[PDB]
């Protein structure tokens, strides 16, 4: 049974906030996950997003497949299209990344992954943006609490998330139809926090921290976490529960905390009925570099946008977005923007 916490609306650094931050860290260190209570508006926005997802998934495959972009990874992923650890995953997905028109300077500059969401319609757009605004408010609360729990300045993590590269996967898992039960293979996600919601069906499993168990650093090309531990216990079933979102760390928190927090491995198994879920990623700015918090002399860094881009290219090797990155050599822009960007997101 997972811990469930109610977060304060504002985090100021008072003793109660520090205490809550300590408890969140302890819950992640024991269970790998906790739940946060939703209020009526958070719940309403969650349910409206789930409803919009169900309606979109009923549309014809040709229409769903048209919701793609060769500039951004936002848009539709068919069942069987994404790859995890060399094997196809079976949800159909709509990914929402930062919604930037071709009038945005980063898009004009050809920055990888920057472009407009191919929304299926404007009611879907509004439902997802409203939900993501609420999710982001929670993400910022969680990051301030986490800083306080580690005895860090309250803004330590939020100083990296201004115009953060927040994104969301809006998922529908089919019922199991063959001998294959795999929904999504074991993996870790890539940013600071994952905040997730699900319907009543059930299928998400997470791996808690295991004493002595070494964890791959998924930001290194030589240590992908995809597939790791797939068939080894322990795996905790995330029981569907009304009125909560779940929260677990992503790769950036594992790196920055030197493993004091671990990016929680997780997987999804198909059930006897279709399953709707949404996974939200509260991320650094695309241009931000994560750094080790507890080793000031350590020179290792993670350029967040580079990690995102690498990951999405490995998930979607044949997507038009990936093809255009390769064709126009957009990973070069990525090394160039490190030194010549004029967004003022980083640097003097
Ligand atoms: N968070 C994302 N974005 O595509 N996918 C999660 C599944 C794992 C992903 N396919 C990987 O190989 O790492
Ligand atoms: O289906 C879920 O509950 C979570 C799916 C997930 O891990 C993801 O999309 O990254
Ligand atoms: Mn995931």
UniProtKB/Swiss-Prot annotation:
Keyword Oxidoreductase listed: yes
EC numbers: 1.13.12.19, 1.14.20.7
Annotated control of activity: Activated by catalase. Inhibited by chelating reagents such as EDTA and Tiron (4,5-dihydroxy-1,3-benzene disulphonic acid), and by DTNB (5,5'-dithio-bis-2-nitrobenzoate) and hydrogen peroxide.
Keyword presence, Chaperone: no
Temperature dependence: Optimum temperature is 20-25 degrees Celsius.
Family as reported in the entry's similarity comment: Belongs to the iron/ascorbate-dependent oxidoreductase family.
Gene expressing this chain: efe
Signal peptide (from-to): none
Record's function text: Simultaneously catalyzes two reactions, namely formation of ethylene and of succinate from 2-oxoglutarate, with a molar ratio of 2:1.
UniProt subunit comment: Monomer.
Protein name (record): 2-oxoglutarate-dependent ethylene/succinate-forming enzyme
Annotated GO biological process: ethylene biosynthetic process
Pfam family, one: 2OG-FeII_Oxy
SUPFAM superfamilies to which the protein is assigned, alphabetical: Clavaminate synthase-like (SSF51197)
Domain Fe2OG dioxygenase stretches: 164-284
Anything else known: A dual-circuit mechanism has been proposed in PubMed:1445291 for the complete reaction, in which the binding of L-arginine and 2-oxoglutarate in a Schiff-base structure generates a common intermediate for the two reactions.
């Amino acid at each position: 049974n997972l811990q469930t916490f109610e977060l304060p609306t504002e985090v100021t650094g008072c003793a109660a906030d520090i205490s809550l931050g300590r408890a969140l860290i302890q819950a992640w260190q024991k269970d790998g996950i906790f739940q946060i209570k939703t209020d009526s508006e958070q719940d309403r926005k969650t349910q409206e997003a789930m409803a919009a997802s169900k309606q979109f998934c009923k549309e014809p495959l040709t229409f769903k497949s048209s919701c793609v972009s060769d500039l951004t990874y936002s848009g539709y992923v068919a069942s069987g299209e994404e790859v995890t650890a060399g094997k196809p995953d079976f949800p159909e997905i709509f990914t929402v990344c930062k919604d930037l028109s071709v009038g945005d300077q980063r898009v004009k500059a050809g920055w990888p992954c920057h472009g407009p969401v191919p929304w299926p319609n404007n009611t879907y757009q509004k439902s997802m943006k409203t939900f993501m605004e609420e999710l982001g408010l929670a993400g910022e609360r969680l990051l301030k609490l986490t800083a306080l729990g580690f005895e860090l300045p309250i803004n330590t993590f939020t100083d990296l998330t201004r115009d953060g590269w927040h994104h969301m996967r809006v998922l529908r898992f089919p019922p199991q139809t063959s001998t294959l039960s795999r929904g999504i293979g074991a993996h870790t996600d890539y940013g600071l926090l994952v905040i997730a919601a699900q319907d009543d069906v059930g299928g998400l499993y997470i791996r808690p921290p295991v004493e002595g168990e070494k964890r791959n650093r998924n930001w290194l090309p030589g240590e992908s976490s995809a597939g790791m531990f797939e068939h080894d216990e322990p795996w905790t079933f995330v029981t569907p529960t009304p009125g909560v979102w779940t929260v677990f760390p992503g790769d950036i928190l594992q790196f920055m905390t030197g493993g004091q927090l671990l990016s929680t491995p997780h997987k999804v198994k198909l059930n006897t009925r279709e399953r709707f879920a949404c996974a939200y990623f509260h991320e650094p700015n695309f241009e931000a570099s994560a750094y080790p918090l507890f080793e000031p002399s350590a020179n290792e860094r993670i350029h967040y946008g580079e990690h995102f881009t690498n990951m999405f290219m490995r998930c979607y090797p044949d997507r038009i977005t990936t093809q255009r990155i390769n064709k126009e050599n957009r990973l070069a822009h990525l090394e160039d923007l490190k030194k010549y960007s004029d967004t003022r997101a980083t640097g003097s």
